Design a binder for this molecule. Structure first.
Ligand SMILES: O=P(O)(O)OC[C@@H]1CC[C@@H](O)O1
Ligand SMILES: [Mn+2]
Ligand SMILES: [Mn+2]
Ligand SMILES: [Mn+2]
Length: 391
């Protein structure tokens, strides 16, 4: 192998400007990093700058440097959708024609009618909501009537809440499985069906740890599958395991925050493995992008950038670091959905003694997967062109 370990970091939703097909998505003018840099009156990301972020594109506070630490370019998304699952599946070598759907006005009557017909239960709610808000609103009705609370978030999910002492847990899971089958349909395709059992009483409802997720498997065998099948290590940190429904994963490290994600990254750098360490930093998307909060987004980016010198100090000569994103989620944009954007790509190894250069623009995210596959000598994915030899 040219690299013994590859550390792949997805900064979730950290887009670097509207993509060529942005218009098809109503995403003209979108620019995640750029609008944040403007809001902040200049972003302080000196370590990303040293890697060459500003060389990809200059933005307020983010300037190009003469001798970037690593190689740099941006990546264009080829798949139809702009959701997390699509982006990640493409990164690991897939092409996804069918987008996952979001439901800002709740779910179509047709879907809910079929779920009712298959379960024998009424459905109440049917709107985007936090799990807390929705429980206070409808928790008591749910208890009294044996109804299912069905709701969504700004993401592609269908959540089903039910009191544990009214609807038995195993029945809630059965219902979620029925919903999971019904939602395998392009009309209403959800990335994730989530059981949200709760207990307590009106004015004091708490969601229990008996939560279960029903994700779809990637539409194809990924580069992670191939690494795993060739006895390499595939360490998933954060949401990565869930995003791929565990496919190709040899070890999974739960995280509770961006800083916690960086701690786990540091843990893997202390590990003697051969293969891929794969981190998703999710706060950018879940806490700031969807909530349209450029101030908190900007602070999160600075907090993350400050963690980077430790990562640099720990990389070995045969380690490669890859930093990218999976779409945009511009916090100064209409609505609550993702934005169709280019994503940055930074590729750094301490063995690059002369620094890096610009790479040709990556025409699919799958170039990352192809690079990983070629490095480890596993079967090349169907999509993607490796840039391994450019490094
Ligand atoms: O509002 P909730 O119930 O806390 O969930 C919000 C989203 C739903 C699933 C995950 O995206 O987090
Ligand atoms: Mn838009
Ligand atoms: Mn995402
Ligand atoms: Mn999202």
């Amino acid at each position: 192998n040219k690299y013994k370990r590859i550390f792949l970091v997805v900064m979730d939703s950290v887009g670097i400007g509207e993509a060529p097909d942005a218009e098809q998505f109503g995403d003209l003018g979108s620019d995640t990093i750029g609008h944040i840099a403007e809001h902040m009156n200049g972003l302080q990301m000196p370590n990303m700058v040293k890697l060459g972020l500003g060389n990809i594109r200059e933005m307020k506070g983010i300037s190009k440097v003469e001798k970037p630490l690593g190689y740099y370019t941006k990546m264009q998304e080829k798949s139809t959708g702009k959701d997390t699952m699509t982006g990640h599946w493409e990164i690991m070598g897939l092409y996804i024609d069918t987008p996952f759907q979001v439901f800002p006005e709740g779910f179509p009557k047709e879907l809910l009618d079929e779920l009712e017909e298959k379960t024998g239960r009424k459905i109440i709610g049917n709107k985007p909501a936090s799990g807390t808000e929705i429980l206070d609103e409808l928790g008591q009705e749910q208890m009294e009537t044996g109804s299912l609370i069905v709701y969504t978030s700004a993401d592609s999910v269908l959540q089903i809440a039910a009191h544990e002492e009214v609807v038995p847990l195993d029945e809630l899971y059965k219902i979620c499985k029925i919903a999971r089958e019904l939602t395998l349909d392009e009309k209403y395709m959800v990335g994730r069906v989530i059981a949200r059992p709760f207990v307590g009483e009106p004015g004091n409802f708490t969601r229990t740890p008996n939560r279960h997720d029903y994700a779809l498997k990637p539409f194809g065998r990924t580069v992670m599958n191939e690494l795993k099948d060739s006895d390499y290590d595939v360490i998933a940190i954060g949401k990565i395991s869930d995003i791929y429904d565990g496919e190709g994963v040899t070890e999974s490290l739960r995280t509770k925050s961006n800083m916690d994600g960086m701690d786990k990254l540091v843990d893997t750098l202390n590990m003697d493995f051969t293969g891929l360490s794969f981190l998703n930093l999710v706060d950018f998307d879940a806490l700031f992008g969807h909530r349209r909060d450029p101030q908190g987004y900007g602070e999160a980016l600075q907090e993350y950038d400050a963690r980077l010198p430790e990562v640099f100090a720990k990389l070995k000569e045969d380690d490669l670091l890859l930093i990218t994103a999976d779409h945009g989620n511009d916090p100064i944009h209409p609505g609550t959905d993702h934005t169709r954007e280019y994503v940055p790509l930074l590729a750094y190894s301490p063995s690059m003694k002369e620094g890096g250069q610009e790479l040709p623009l990556r025409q699919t995210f799958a170039d990352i997967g192809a690079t990983v596959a070629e490095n480890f000598g596993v079967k090349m994915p169907e999509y993607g062109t490796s840039f391994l030899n450019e490094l």
